[model samples]
Target: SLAFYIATFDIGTTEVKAALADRDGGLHFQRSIALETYGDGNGPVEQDAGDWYDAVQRIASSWWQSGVDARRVSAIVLSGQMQNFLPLDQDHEPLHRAVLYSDKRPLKEAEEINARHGADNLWSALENPMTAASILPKLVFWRASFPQAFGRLRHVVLGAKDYVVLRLTGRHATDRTNASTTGLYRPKDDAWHVELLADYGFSLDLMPRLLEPGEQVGGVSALAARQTGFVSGTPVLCGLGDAGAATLGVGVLDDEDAYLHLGTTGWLARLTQTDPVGDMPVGTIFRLAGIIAGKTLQVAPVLNAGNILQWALTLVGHRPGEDCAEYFHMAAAEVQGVTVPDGLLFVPYLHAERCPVELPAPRGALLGVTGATTRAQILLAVLEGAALSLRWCAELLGMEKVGLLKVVGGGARSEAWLRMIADNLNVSLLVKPDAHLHPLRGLAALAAVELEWSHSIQDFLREADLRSNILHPQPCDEGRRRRKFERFKQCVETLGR
Candidate 1:
């Protein structure tokens, strides 16, 4: 008998990834195509939704070319970056390039929104502060900037993968985890706040139908099947947002179980049953919907992470128009053990920030550079700056003294870099092998449980002989890192004025 399998894709900000795995979470096939983000250095960031479909189609074809039996596949699921401003015409074609999660062009609209509907009121309902990145203000930005497209808009999907889901099923749908990030959904009610949405002029009809992460959305359509070579009726699940999936992928099921995700972006998230938002539960804390009902993944977002590393890649020796992400990691390894100069600090805020600091127009700075500084010192400053940002995010989330934090994402792969993060935070770090694949693995688990390959998500996870390599902080690196971290905060706060 052929073993049952699940096919999954992670449509991220930087690349679109796909994989096939058996019910027990063993990988059978994996591949990814680099995705392009369109933006000027300081303005809005965008990506073509059509580019996502082209990449997914190519990846789907590769699975068949590899001679993998598509028949054994029981489900297809997706995990992607959440909080995008994407509007589509009635025919489902994008009205404009996808306004990515990292784009901060909606500052004026965000302020307009907060002023019109009191920031506290918005926070009380959505469990997150309205930022320039939120979908609501982006919609307002779209209406004011691209009025023609806004007039023709029929649907809005928040997550990057949600667009891919619509293309596959021709069914407008998104999971709770993705929807929770929109400045529009009411987490407690599990519904769109129609009255609030009315004020924005984006009708309730444009919203995608919300689904539980593990619930089946719709099967692949005949047209989609022809394009991708999958069976027309292959089941599809509206999987969790990339963050939620990464949380589950780490196999942290218990409350207070936490992990830090470092990818094109970064975040410090912990699992919780109680609202992470305290009175509102929490505001800076995004109490995002988890895979299971009533589950919340509390997250403190970092606008900079691997992107910061990529910046340093160009400074060292990375060529444009090539896959140079690994070069960033490889270059940093050269000065692995160098003590960074206290004077050289890099603020990790190339994009606007949300948590720890809410300055909308603050750009990153590489401060205190001396003529004597080595390339190693500069590289270490970039890495330390990102780690310090996460530490600050974690502290704000009340996880400052957390005993252990499991790490996942592409940024976690480098031992040299991992040690920097581990040492900078002064905590034990447990990194899963193939750390970058957690989001894919996490989506696979959701599909496995939904198909009854296992009784429940927790029971499904019990099969893995999950061994993790733990990296504990070094005492020698602590004091210097701490003293510089204070200065890093001072720099950011100083720039606020």
Candidate 2:
């Protein structure tokens, strides 16, 4: 009998998700395992690689026990956090803790490299500014701080999903989307910038072979099948970064379609038929390979989003895993009859800014606290701050007219926040029914395309009607949002200076 399902896994900074989809790309069964980050004081973030493998096995076990035949799973696809540097030795064992996307310990090394090569020269080669947060700079830091481990570094994988791919297929490979974030690969030429890498004493041998997103890179090994209850020889697709996967998952297949993803991190991206017209904005806009070959995705990734809400929830004495809906409801109710709080501005830089600014030292601020202020006001301010920051990123992209922007990620569940974002950006928001599952849906779509289950991926999307609700802007709240947005910009500019 033919397999009837495909399994997609999302390896995120905050959680691991496994979604089982039917042949038509409908999400059937799903499971999630929460993940924690271990960060040093100076921006070195990591998580144990074993935790990720364990999470996937648990989800696989649950699926198998639920009377769903593991043999019926046609393929396994992955979508993961990007820009991480995980070094594996000859035995495919991790040499050290994975350097996360947010790690910025290689700041001095990045600056020195840029100084020697010149920003324009390096940017031309890299398609973006060199930053300590990217993979290349992190590798530079690793070579200096841990020489023995660096010497033993046999291969460099981007994120947890790549590790999963290697474990399953006994092959080391990465997709072009995640490879674009390395600051070493030249997207225009489709190869690593060997000249630039030689200056850092690194070579192309450390990088994994690149593959297109939906291409079948390898098959499940016998050992992997026994360990995870998956059928041996199951085909595995070379997956994509979370951003690109979510972009495709939301059915943004055309040129005009754009999406704002508000996951642990966030981004506003648009699909483009041609390469980005002029020089790509170094810290602001990046051009990456689309899921479809020969297309591109232009994105401005913001390092803060749903994490802000999580941080706020923690600050208010809520348990780590408690539902945040109660607080969002409180904030929604609090704003029903109140004016925008006087000078209650917040910069949701809980983490460092990626777009608009590349520095890694900024911390979040909640200004204008007075004795008379209440917790409800603070809650509303956080929501408003997040929306304003998003608007700022959109403006940086020169997005003059946003007809209808699709919203995805965990943050899309908050109706109050969506309304605020719509008002702040003065654009309508579209929320899909499975907005939170955008990345997983994208992975399934990749599998469907590769498996010949769909004639064309775009046709499948149109038949599915993925876009659900259209969130029109609140006309009555326009003036308030505009006024505060200006203040928000001023506050960000002042602090940035």
Candidate 3:
């Protein structure tokens, strides 16, 4: 009877979500809760593990009272903000606060290490300030300042998803997709880089044993089941980081399959059947083990895609119900297909970037701004500039035969933005319904494939209902898109020069 039901939690920086869904392939019940991260600190950003657990408990307590039986949960999946670092003691309790991925205290150290390693030695390895945002640098930070906590640390872990999985199943392990983000893990080696530990002055012993993203770790611990009201003996799948899970959620399970994620940032991901076939080519590329056994995802992550509008809003006004998305779209529409003006050049690397490229200190600039520049035109230019940045990433991976970008994330909500992407890249863009569905979509893919929920992932996707919206490039807009795209390339290159 396929009456399967599960619970999923996406532990994000600003918010946490709990969703209950059934085998009918729909979200039956859901709740969202907010968290306040204490940001005014002397070092990297940190969060208490106990506070996270309390939040989860509060949400679970509410769920139980709301008449949703946690015991009915056949599966428990967790997705979290990527690249965070939190270490635990031998008993699996947190030894220190969770260090966020954006924390940049170890930037200088990472840069020094990479300078010695050299770019050609490992093209994909980026030891940027952001790369040091994980527990690796936190370990360094601890050893230098808080030696007491460093000595107490037993297992250094990734995000909340990894931590919560331990709380649920009593296992302390991480997945490849999340591990790849740590400056310590060499994707080429497909294992923890013991050498990197020496190079960065971190200990390899601090990290947990890593597993592939979807491997079934075990059933929920009896204690965990009781605390959360989860079904006794429920199978808990070891999931990946939120982004890693979203890749599967969107069903990008085959080779050459690719997508663009436009949320707070923009990213380009391409599924590679093999290890990208190289001695490591230069570009943004992180090899993540896919849902399928022995497969990998070549990811090109770019920071600051949709964030520009937020920056604009900060400068203009701050209020509830601001409707930035609506205003940005309305503003983008004012530019009637006139591509880049002759002298205008926009570099979308307004912030630090990731994937196919990593530039920690890249500044954002609008060249050739004139007195005639309207606010709406600037917004339009923002969209164009952001699309161009992603297009550059897409082209780098596309050269390796990864074409046809599937657009995901909140930025995918903008029709004008989608059109800009299509017009700029001159490739097909397929946007799937329910951007919210990404979390479970990823977990469901793992369950369907590994738990034998369906015969195969493709079979599940084909039989499974997905209402897709396809947007193709307009031939009329192609000429302008092409010419501007070339200049976009020129300006980006010139900036580097």
Candidate 4:
């Protein structure tokens, strides 16, 4: 008889999770532990790779506490945060702190590379802008600032999942979704951009082996098995990045399939057949390789989404000791279906935005506010602004005719937020049940396909029977909304400048 379950792990920004996936796509024996990140203001944001490993071991040992059998696990799957710059020595030890995806310390180095090779030239080849968070600039910054550490740098990996995979299987390998974000890989060519690497004074020798997301790298090593309480020969599959996993979790496999993510940050992901290349299209398009082979995810990412509510809480009056989220939802309900003044509008750019409206500086504003305005109206307006931005983001992807789009993430928990998006974007939204576990669902899908337990991904999803809750746009004053949006757009050019 075969094993009854699949083991999955998700390494989050400040949290790590483990769960058991049964054959029918249900999750069990779930365990979670919190980790920490260190950052000094706007400078380097770092984390301890050892802390991630420790949490993984704790979760593994946790299965024993719950009377779960490790031998019953058929395989291991992983998905985590992407765009990391982690370095290792010849002996496979971390050379320095693991610099995270959000860290922007390499701006000067990134700009220098932009100057050396015209920024347009590099963006054309890489298909992504040479931002400070991109690994190419980080590689150059590491070499210029620390020559001693640079000399001993033997291998490079681009994500949290890759680091765990190396520790679990002792193999230096990464998947296409993660590798495509490294600022070193060419998705269309399906290879490393050696010419760009050489221009930056690096080579392909320092990179990890690229593989498909569902490929099985190897079995768990004896060292890993001993520490994690797993069978020595348990299979380990190269799972995907968290974003791609979230996409797959919603069952968007075919070309032109799309979804809207509403987490701390938000984005619109649509699978396309073409490369989407142009004069620095990557800067605005910011696409990634899809989970399915030979497909590209045209992503329109925005820095502000659900997190704006947290900022709004400080601006409005509230009592102490109340759960902030509950308070916001209750306040939001008070203004449900309420219309604001004609001139009022908000630009949800609390941080620098990358797509639709590229503002490097913070131009966030709540304009047309008068003395008669109520606090609840402001919160309602905030949601409307984000909804408009999402609409703009979709249009940038040339998604004029979007199908029934799946909306899943932290923001989907709010009823007011759901209605805001549906009414403003003028599209139907589908929220899958247990949407919080989407990343794990995506990973489990990969493992099932790899093990051939399901004849195909579409078949597995059909059998899983995930229920969907659909919401459609509500009637509203279209003329007034159009006028407010025009003012919002006009202000971006006049007041924003």
Candidates' lDDT values, in order? 0.79, 0.79, 0.68, 0.80
Model 2 regions more than 4 Å off: 1-3, 40-42, 263-265, 276-283, 304-326, 337-351, 358-385, 433-436, 464-467, 474-488, 495-497
Clashes of each: 4, 0, 9, 0
User: Sorted by TM-score, highest first, which candidate order results?
Assistant: 4, 3, 2, 1
Deviation (Å) of 308 in candidate 2: 5.3
Between which residue pairs do clashes occur in model 3?
A: 71-230, 71-231, 249-441, 249-442, 283-356, 284-355, 284-356, 284-357, 301-354
18, model 4: CA deviation in Å?
Answer: 1.5
Q: In candidate 4, residue 178 scores what lDDT?
A: 79
- Report clash pairs, candidate 1: 277-281, 277-282, 278-281, 278-282
All candidates: TM-score: 0.84, 0.86, 0.86, 0.93
Residue 42 lDDT, candidate 4, scale 0-100: 57
Please, what are the lDDT tens digits per residue for candidate 1 over residues 280-394? 4322678787465666777887767778877778777788876885775577567676877778888878875676676556568888888898888888778888888877877
Which of candidates 3 and 4 is the stronger one according to TM-score? 4
* Cα lDDT tens digits for candidate 2, 163-193: 8889889998888888777787788888888
How does candidate 4 fare on TM-score? 0.93
lDDT of 2 at 316: 61
TM-score of 2: 0.86
